[PDB]
Design a protein around this ligand. Structure first.
Ligand SMILES: [Zn+2]
Ligand SMILES: [Zn+2]
Ligand SMILES: [Zn+2]
Length: 89
DNA sequence: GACGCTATAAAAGGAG
DNA sequence: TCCTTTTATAGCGTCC
């Protein structure tokens, strides 16, 4: 069994290797958000959801682009940006 | 075009 | 293992 943990929701039925990931996933169904932003008090489903958000307050931009050295708050925004240097408008 | 941001999935770290 | 963190992937929505 590579992914022994299955989602209880008949409709969804997503599979996971670690039980942690299954519990975290189930939260999207129940709508429970255990991670709270201490500035605006908003709630998030994940550790990363909260971390991505704290940066909107702090203005921290950890991710730099290799080509132009421009900074971004999140990983995806940075990765997606780099692709523009490989094409025209 | 570009990118700020939220969501969510996949994986890894660390301690008992 | 269980719990904490980290990395990856998808879109949305809006301004340019
Ligand atoms: Zn599910
Ligand atoms: Zn906040
Ligand atoms: Zn760049």
């Amino acid at each position: 069994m590579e992914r022994p943990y299955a989602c209880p929701v008949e409709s969804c039925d997503r599979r996971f290797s670690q039980k942690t990931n299954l519990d975290t996933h189930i939260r999207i169904h129940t709508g429970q958000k255990p991670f709270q932003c201490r500035i605006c008090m908003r709630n998030f489903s994940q550790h990363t959801g909260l971390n991505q958000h704290i940066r909107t307050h702090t203005g921290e931009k950890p991710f730099a682009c290799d080509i132009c050295g421009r900074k971004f708050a999140t990983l995806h925004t940075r990765d997606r940006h780099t692709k523009i240097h490989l094409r025209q408008k």
